[PDB]
């Protein structure tokens, strides 16, 4: 194994890439994009002071990635801490549960495209896919899923504005802005139908399904 100085150096260096792991290998990305899109939808571009949305997304990600973290700890961190598995093998052992989560959610078309772009040989099963193919395929699938969720989210908040504008126009009040009238009604809707519990549960199911 590596010398203790080398192990400490590698550990300290790997501690740097934590935001990269959170953004490109974790549920955080499609746990945010939805929040940004929803904030764009309600007409309040500030409302939940960002930091609030970031904290909620962090807690949601922690609750969602719990089984993956548990599997990594039981399979990789526990043997490594007990001097049973070397430092250069704990990483390889722990990268597998994260890779499997990254697959359970990564679409195919993306996998085929990034298998073609690397000029790699045929991949008869999912067990032959390396991380260099799964990483951007997972990223693209997460982006597409987040945008789909946000774009079906956007529809009712535009429907309300449409009906508000039509009703205002029936009576000839053509110089009344419709957005100012629609914003309180959009807030009322998002209050009534458990705006956040339904969205939270839908996102969590969207991961576990």
């Amino acid at each position: 194994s590596w010398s203790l100085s080398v192990q400490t150096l590698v550990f300290i260096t790997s501690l740097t890439f934590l935001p990269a792991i959170l953004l490109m290998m974790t549920s955080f990305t499609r746990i945010i994009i939805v929040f940004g899109l929803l904030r764009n939808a309600l007409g309040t571009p500030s409302a939940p002071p960002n930091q609030v949305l970031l904290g909620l997304a962090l807690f949601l990600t922690f609750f969602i990635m719990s089984p993956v973290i548990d599997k990594i700890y039981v399979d990789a961190y526990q043997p490594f801490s007990e001097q049973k598995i070397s430092m250069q093998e704990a990483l390889d052992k722990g990268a597998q549960p994260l890779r499997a989560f990254m697959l359970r959610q990564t679409r195919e078309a993306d996998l085929a495209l990034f298998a073609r772009l690397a000029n790699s040989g045929p991949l008869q099963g999912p067990e032959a896919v390396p991380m260099r193919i799964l990483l951007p395929a997972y990223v693209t699938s997460e982006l597409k899923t987040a945008f789909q969720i946000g774009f079906t989210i956007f529809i009712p908040f535009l429907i309300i504005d449409l009906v508000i504008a039509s009703v205002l126009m029936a009576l000839g009040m053509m110089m009344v802005p419709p957005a100012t009238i629609a914003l309180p009604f959009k807030l009322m809707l998002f209050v009534l139908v458990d705006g956040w519990q339904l969205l939270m549960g839908s996102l969590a199911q969207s991961f576990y399904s």
Binding site: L23, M24, L117, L135, F147, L158, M169, G172
Partner: protein, 253 residues
């Protein structure tokens, strides 16, 4: 030993990164501000990590005007691809805004052009529907694949360039209008007839019509008409995407 020649790796990983990131910042859905900047940068970095080793590495120094010409070339290619793709969504937005304006939804533009009071809500509705359809047809994967493919056609190394080709992209500005009418031609026409019908009502007893009976009727009719017309955009959506894609393939070369 312990060489790790850094200039070779930098020159191999830089220019493909520049082109990929130039496409990312302009390509639809991949350029939307809702994505955090670091996610976009990481996607570009990973795509370059996958692609660059297969390409022939360039040796032009970063401290030369040749490097500036290369960077300008990559930026031009990326923005051209992204913008040519964006033209289709521009056309859909145009068609939606025109249907909405014939609804009488925003009448204040006819009296105060650009007076901070405009709501093309139908344009937004069909814009997001078009984005959903583009996501479904996996257009973004195609965009990434074509960004990769333009190398074989046009390598990183500085290559000479043509002219009317730029016009083509600029001439694509016509499609936004042309195809836009192709999306609005049925419904607007019937709306036109409806307005014509309202005219027949105004040829009777003077006044006492229009601005009091025409607006609600035409609003409801436009609503149900284009609600029924919604299933029609998807074949036109695929037609628009195919037009943009094969125009890009023909003209980029």
């Amino acid at each position: 030993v312990t060489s790790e020649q850094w200039l070779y790796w930098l020159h191999l990983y830089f220019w493909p990164l520049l082109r990929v990131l130039a496409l990312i910042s302009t390509a639809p859905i991949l350029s939307e501000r809702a994505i955090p900047k670091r996610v976009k940068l990481g996607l570009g970095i990973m795509i370059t990590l996958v692609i660059a080793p297969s390409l022939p590495a360039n040796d032009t120094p970063l401290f030369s005007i040749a490097a500036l010409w290369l960077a300008m070339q990559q930026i031009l290619i990326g923005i051209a691809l992204g913008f040519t793709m964006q033209f289709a969504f521009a056309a859909v937005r145009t068609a939606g805004e025109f249907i909405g304006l014939q609804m009488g939804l925003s009448f204040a533009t006819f009296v105060d052009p650009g007076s901070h009071l405009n709501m093309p809500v139908l344009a937004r509705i069909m814009d997001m529907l078009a984005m959903l359809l583009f996501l479904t047809f996996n257009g973004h994967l195609w965009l990434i694949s074509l960004l990769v493919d333009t190398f074989h056609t046009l390598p990183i190394g500085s290559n000479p360039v043509n002219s009317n080709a730029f016009m083509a992209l600029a001439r694509a500005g016509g499609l936004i209008f042309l195809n836009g009418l192709m999306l609005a031609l049925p419904v607007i026409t019937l709306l036109l007839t409806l307005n014509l019908a309202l005219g027949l009502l105004n040829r009777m007893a003077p006044q006492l019509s229009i601005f009091v009976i025409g607006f609600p009727l035409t609003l409801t009719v436009g609503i149900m008409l284009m609600a029924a017309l919604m299933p029609l955009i998807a074949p036109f959506c695929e037609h628009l995407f195919s037009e943009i894609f094969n125009l890009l393939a023909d003209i980029v070369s």
